[model samples]
Target: LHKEPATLIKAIDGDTVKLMYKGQPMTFRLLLVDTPETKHPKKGVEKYGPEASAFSKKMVENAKKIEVEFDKGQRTDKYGRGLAYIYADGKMVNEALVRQGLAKVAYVYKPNNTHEQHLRKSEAQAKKEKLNIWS
Candidate 1:
């Protein structure tokens, strides 16, 4: 229910990106995680604000082709766009962001969490490393 061998163009925000998969335009929302927003210049940014964006950008930059994996409920978000977990070089980008304290687990809408335990563990590690954003 998803595509493969995708190339990332750029990250639109903490969660979204512009990509090209199989010569078609694709917008992927990094599932199960939400990073601090760095888009609003005037708003108060979270801790590791710039770092989060930089890290994510770096990951995308270093990867030539990304692989997309979808959940059982794979569907467009409220904005009518596809959502999936982006993987590069065998690393899960979404989980990596959380593991690095660049993002927090977001499980608000659907409780059908298939990756909750993994994400929670990642967040715990980030916290133990004193990567608290609101502190």
Candidate 2:
């Protein structure tokens, strides 16, 4: 996979992040994962949302390097945010969130499901282990 180098600007939430991509600040919605809402206007604050956001923020903030990998499907969502897999120090941050039970494997749109297999496996493991959201 070809990963575009990026600089972490902030974790907008657990599943959304802001980064400097190609010298431009961009918002990216982490593909194949969805976390609880920390500040959704309708949902307000969901359970464990704060924890998920904090974890995501810490992961990106502490990474030696951050990168964005686009799948073969639509590169951007209707919101115009980039749909991508975020990597932190070579680790798949999206998968990490699911494994930690902070996020769930979701939004499996066609062609963009490139990483769905492992993401679901991680979600299953987290569910079986009763970690966080699964608890």
Candidate 3:
């Protein structure tokens, strides 16, 4: 099963956020999807970044309950940020971004990868629809 019991602190961007895990703040990067650069210092805001950020904000901010599920294998990324699939109102935020065409599949591996297949399917559908970043 996936790890749970986290409250959303803030949506840093479409694919990243700060969460309260056992009363401490931790960076929760969405596991299988990546959004464009919104806070990158040099790159600044890329196209569709703001909209993606806005979408994430709207989803998380409006949700009554925020929960996080860590990837089955490795829970953190290279920078030590916790990699997870965030859920709000029982809906997956990572899949939402992909479904709405806000983000794309990223950091997918064969065995360690858990949600890669469904995430891939969501991205494909979004691309076919020419949604958000795909457009």
CA-lDDT, candidates in order: 0.76, 0.93, 0.85
- Highest lDDT: give the candidate number: 2
Alpha-carbon deviation at 10 in model 2, angstroms:
1.6
Clashes of each: 0, 0, 0
Q: Write the per-residue lDDT of candidate 2 for residues 26-128, one digit (tens) a residue.
A: 9999998989978877979999999999999999999999989999989999998999999999999999999999999986779899899999999999999
Global lDDT of model 1: 0.76
Q: Please identify which of the two predictions, 1 or 3, would achieve the higher TM-score against the true structure.
A: 3
The predicted structure with the larger lDDT, 1 or 3, is: 3
Q: What's each prediction's TM-score? A: 0.83, 0.97, 0.92
For candidate 2, give the lDDT of residue 48.
92
Give lDDT tens digits, candidate 1, residues 1-135: 454688877777667778887688878778888787777766766557677777777788798668887776745678766677778776888888898778899864563356778988989998889675524
RMSD of 1: 2.5
Comparing 2 with 3 on lDDT, the higher-scoring candidate is 2
